Structures are given as structure tokens and as C-alpha cells.
Amino acid sequence: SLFRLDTSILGTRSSTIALADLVEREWRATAPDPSVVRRHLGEDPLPATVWAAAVAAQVPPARRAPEEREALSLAAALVDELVAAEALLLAAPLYNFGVSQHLKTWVDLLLTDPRMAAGTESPLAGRPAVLVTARGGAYGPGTPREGWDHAIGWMRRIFGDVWKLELTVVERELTLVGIDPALDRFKELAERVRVTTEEQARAAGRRLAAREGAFLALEHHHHHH
Amino acid sequence: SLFRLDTSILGTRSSTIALADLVEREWRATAPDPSVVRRHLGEDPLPATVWAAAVAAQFVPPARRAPEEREALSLAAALVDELVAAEALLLAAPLYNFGVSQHLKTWVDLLLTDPRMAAGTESPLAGRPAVLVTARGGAYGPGTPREGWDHAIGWMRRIFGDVWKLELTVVERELTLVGIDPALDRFKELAERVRVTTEEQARAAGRRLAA
Numbered sequence: 001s002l003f004r005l006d007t008s009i010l011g012t013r014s015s016t017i018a019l020a021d022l023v024e025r026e027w028r029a030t031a032p033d034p035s036v037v038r039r040h041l042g043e044d045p046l047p048a049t050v051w052a053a054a055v056a057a058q059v060p061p062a063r064r065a066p067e068e069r070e071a072l073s074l075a076a077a078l079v080d081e082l083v084a085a086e087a088l089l090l091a092a093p094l095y096n097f098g099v100s101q102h103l104k105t106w107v108d109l110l111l112t113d114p115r116m117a118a119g120t121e122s123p124l125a126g127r128p129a130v131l132v133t134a135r136g137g138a139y140g141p142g143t144p145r146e147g148w149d150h151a152i153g154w155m156r157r158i159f160g161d162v163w164k165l166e167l168t169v170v171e172r173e174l175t176l177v178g179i180d181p182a183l184d185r186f187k188e189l190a191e192r193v194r195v196t197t198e199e200q201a202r203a204a205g206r207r208l209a210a211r212e213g214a215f216l217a218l219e220h221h222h223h224h225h
Numbered sequence: 226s227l228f229r230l231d232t233s234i235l236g237t238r239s240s241t242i243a244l245a246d247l248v249e250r251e252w253r254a255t256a257p258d259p260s261v262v263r264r265h266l267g268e269d270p271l272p273a274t275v276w277a278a279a280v281a282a283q284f285v286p287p288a289r290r291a292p293e294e295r296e297a298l299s300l301a302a303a304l305v306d307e308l309v310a311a312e313a314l315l316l317a318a319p320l321y322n323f324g325v326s327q328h329l330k331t332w333v334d335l336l337l338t339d340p341r342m343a344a345g346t347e348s349p350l351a352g353r354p355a356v357l358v359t360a361r362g363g364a365y366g367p368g369t370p371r372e373g374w375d376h377a378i379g380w381m382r383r384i385f386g387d388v389w390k391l392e393l394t395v396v397e398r399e400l401t402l403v404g405i406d407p408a409l410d411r412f413k414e415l416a417e418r419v420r421v422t423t424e425e426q427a428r429a430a431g432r433r434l435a436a
């Protein structure tokens with residue numbers, strides 16, 4: 001099955017939901033198990049108080065207080081959702097130059113579970129994940145916003161370096177063109193980016209769906225000779 | 226008055242609360258107005274639902290706003306009122322899971338829904354003095370295996386310095402897990418040096434804010 005995580009707070013208008021929908025459509029069309037499990041942190045955020053309760057409890061059980069037992073039980077349920085998935089679809093818009101408050105809360109709580117604790121091997125290592133992001137402006141090298149996306153590096157750190165996922169990133173920029181008058185000079189560029197990024201999302205879903213066969217077709221395993 | 230923001234979830238054991246205490250002591254010992262307003266997001270976090278409700282409210286005609294929408298915008302204005310009321314800021318934010326405090330991000334996100342903090346508006350905090358205290362369990366210095374692994378500090382400097390235009394002093398204490406995590410035992414001497422130097426930077430930063 002696919003596990004899909006959404007973080008947009010902009011509801012039916014969400015650009016990330018729309019890109020993730022294109023990935024999911026291709027997954028459903030070609031995946032051996034087209035099943036999808038979904039969690040929408042933007043509509044159903046985790047409580048602001050659970051992480052601190054889980055951290056405190058992270059102590060001999062039995063002594064844990066109700067809020068601490070509830071906090072770690074929720075963290076176990078969230079890890080169960082990820083480890084049950086053959087592949088991940090994660091959607092995270094850029095909000096105030098930084099990480100979604102909802103995504104950070106989710107990762108923080110996941111890492112309180114023993115299977116995701118420091119000095120453990122990632123229970124997700126080698127699994128494929130597509131990360132969908134969107135930005136109102138343009139943040140590539142040479143731009144006035146170069147280095148102003150403080151989220152993407154952290155997401156690449158947790159997903160790729162800590163959990164050891166095989167990460168594909170689809171990023172749609174210039175989503176506030178046609179909304180903020182200051183961006184009007186970008187109108188033609190923004191339309192080419194939308195069309196290109198929508199195709200990248202479809203492409204990402206087709207690749208995610210084929211990963212198991214692609215892995216089985218590999219014979220080169222870096223054996224000595 | 227001083228405005229003091231804490232984010233630690235580690236209570237009495239907090240290293241950021243301890244370093245920030247060094248700054249606040251100078252304020253209360255020497256500032257003409259030694260009054261301190263404090264908010265502890267680690268102990269009293271903002272609700273996980275309020276930010277989305279404040280953004281949602283912006284799309285809703287004012288006379289038609291639901292209570293949750295009106296209240297989210299009112300809380301945003303109250304949080305901005307606390308910052309605008311202060312002559313100086315003291316902000317304490319540990320490194321947690323290589324990134325920003327969930328509580329600090331939530332607080333910044335809500336603040337920025339307030340019209341005085343809107344994009345294209347001049348910061349109402351421009352030029353005001355601020356001290357940022359952070360702590361890391363490990364060593365993230367140049368050449369380390371953790372260089373670039375603190376994705377929080379750059380963001381906090383972006384909002385506090387580049388967006389709000391605060392006169393920002395940063396005090397960073399590393400190696401706070403020396404003495405707790407056995408794999409850091411080789412850093413005992415360095416960690417004590419870092420403690421001494423950072424404690425003095427905090428005192429000095431407090432003496433500046435107050436004078």
C-alpha cells in the first residue's frame with residue numbers, strides 16, 4: 001500500500017493536495033497494491049501537548065501517567081502506519097520560510113517510539129518516498145530567496161539521511177503568481193512551471209508504482225571481485 | 226520591560242532556561258525597567274488548530290466570522306501586543322530532531338497572521354534589541370559529522386533578523402549531552418570550555434540589553 005501524508009491548511013484549493021493527487025492517481029493505475037492509507041495533519045493536526053508527554057515517558061512503563069501512556073500509544077500507531085507502507089507520499093507546502101508546524105509535530109512524536117529512537121536502524125530504510133512541496137515565490141540559486149526555504153533541507157535530512165528513504169522531490173514554485181500583484185512579471189514562467197511540475201508528479205507516481213519490479217530486476221549488488 | 230519566550234519541554238532540567246536565566250538576571254539587576262513578561266510555550270503550548278483558523282478567518286467576511294476564527298485572530302493580536310510592548314526580547318529555543326521547535330514555529334506562524342506582521346509591512350520590531358539562546362546536545366561545528374545538521378538556527382536568524390529586523394545577538398551552547406550520552410565522553414574538556422564561554426556570552430548579552 002501507499003501511505004499519503006498531507007499538511008496543507010488551505011483545504012480544497014491546496015496546490016500540494018493537487019500535485020499529490022497526480023502522484024496517487026498513477027500509483028492507483030499501475031501499483032501491484034493500489035491501496036492508499038492517508039493522514040491529513042492540516043485538517044486533523046496532532047495535539048500540541050502529546051510530544052512533551054511522550055518525551056517524559058520515553059521511564060520504566062507501568063509508572064507512566066495517563067497522558068504519557070496516551071502519548072506513546074499514539075506515537076506507536078503513527079509508526080505502525082509508516083512501517084505498513086511499501087512507499088510514502090508526503091505533501092509539505094512552504095509556510096513562513098520554514099517547516100510545517102504539523103509535519104514537525106508528527107516527526108517529533110514518531111521519534112519517541114522505540115523503533116524510531118536514536119541509535120536504531122530505520123524501519124523504513126531503502127523504501128521509496130515522493131515528497132511534494134510548493135512555494136509562493138522562486139527560491140533557486142541566483143534568486144533573492146536562495147537559502148530562504150529552511151524546510152526542504154530538514155525534510156531531506158529526516159526522510160533521506162535519518163530514515164534512509166529513496167526520496168524523489170517534486171517542487172512547484174510561483175504558486176502566488178496571479179495572487180500577489182508584485183509577482184506579475186512571473187506570469188508566463190509560472191504557467192510553464194505548473195505544466196512541467198504536474199507532469200513530474202505523474203512521472204513520480206509511475207516510478208513509485210514500478211519500484212518493486214525495478215528492485216527485483218537489479219543484479220548488481222556491489223559484491224567484491 | 227523585557228519579553229522572555231521559553232520553548233524547552235525538559236522543565237527544571239532545561240539548559241536553554243538556565244542560559245536565558247543568565248541574561249534575565251542582568252536585566253532585573255540593572256535595567257531601569259527590570260519588569261519581565263514571560264511566555265513558556267514548552268509548558269503552555271499554543272493549540273495545534275489556532276494557526277489554520279487565523280489563516281481561514283482571513284478569507285471570511287469579518288461580520289461572518291465564526292468564534293474560533295475571531296478568537297484565533299484575537300490571540301494573534303495579543304501575541305504581537307506582547308512583542309510590541311517590550312523594549313527588548315529574550316528568546317530561548319533548543320535544537321530538537323535537527324529542526325525548529327514545534328512550539329516556536331506555531332507561535333511565529335500565528336504572529337504572522339496579524340496585520341502588523343503582514344508581508345510588505347515594515348516590522349513593528351525593527352531595530353529592537355533581542356538575544357537568542359539555543360542549545361544542542363552534540364557538536365555541529367565546521368568539519369564535524371553534524372555540520373549543516375542544525376536546520377533550526379538559520380530559520381530563527383531569518384525570522385528574527387531578516388524579517389523582523391531585530392538587532393539580534395545569538396548565544397549557542399553545544400555539547401549539552403556530554404555527561405549523559407556515553408558516545409560523547411571524548412568531548413568532556415571541550416564541553417566545559419563551551420559552557421564557560423557561552424555562560425559569559427549570555428551574561429555579556431544581558432549587560433548589553435540592560436545598559
Ligand SMILES: Cc1cc2nc3c(=O)[nH]c(=O)nc-3n(C[C@H](O)[C@H](O)[C@H](O)COP(=O)(O)OP(=O)(O)OC[C@H]3O[C@@H](n4cnc5c(N)ncnc54)[C@H](O)[C@@H]3O)c2cc1C
Pocket residue numbers: 008009010013014015016017093094095096097098134135136137138175176179280
Ligand atoms: C501562512 C502562509 C505562509 C506562507 N509562507 C510562504 C513562504 O514563506 N514562502 C513562500 O514562497 N510561499 C509562502 N506561502 C505561499 C504558499 O507556499 C503557497 O500558497 C503554496 O502553494 C501552499 O501550498 P498549499 O498546498 O497549502 O496550497 P496553495 O498553493 O496555496 O493552493 C491555493 C491556491 O491559491 C493560492 N492561494 C490562495 N489563497 C492563499 C493563501 N492565503 N496563501 C497562499 N496561497 C494562497 C495558492 O498559492 C494556490 O495557487 C505561504 C502561504 C501561507 C498561507
Ligand SMILES: Cc1cc2nc3c(=O)[nH]c(=O)nc-3n(C[C@H](O)[C@H](O)[C@H](O)COP(=O)(O)OP(=O)(O)OC[C@H]3O[C@@H](n4cnc5c(N)ncnc54)[C@H](O)[C@@H]3O)c2cc1C
Pocket residue numbers: 055233234235238239240241242319320321322323324360361362363364401402403405
Ligand atoms: C526530543 C529531543 C530531541 C533532540 N534532538 C536533538 C538533535 O537533533 N540534535 C542535538 O544536538 N540535540 C538534540 N537534543 C538534545 C537537546 O538539543 C539538548 O539536550 C538541549 O540542551 C535541549 O535544551 P533544553 O533547554 O530543552 O534543556 P537540556 O539541555 O536538555 O537540559 C537537560 C540536561 O540534561 C541533558 N538531557 C538529559 N536527558 C535529556 C533528554 N531526554 N533530551 C535532551 N537532553 C537531555 C541535556 O543535554 C542537558 O544537559 C534533543 C533532545 C530532545 C529531548
